[PDB]
Amino acid sequence: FFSLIPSLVGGLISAFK
């Protein structure tokens, strides 16, 4: 239920591409 996620959680996403 967090918000304004940091490049931290988003980082793992970029890896998935």
Residue at token pair 């970029």: 14
> How far is residue 7 CA from its own chain's centroid?
5
Residues 6 or more apart whose Cβ sits within 8 Å of residue 1: none
Residues 6 or more apart whose Cβ sits within 8 Å of residue 5: none
Residues 14 and 17: their CA atoms lie apart, in Å, by 5
The experimental method behind these coordinates is NMR
Residues 7 and 9: their CA atoms lie apart, in Å, by 6
End-to-end CA distance of the chain: 24
R_g (Cα) of the chain, nearest Å = 8
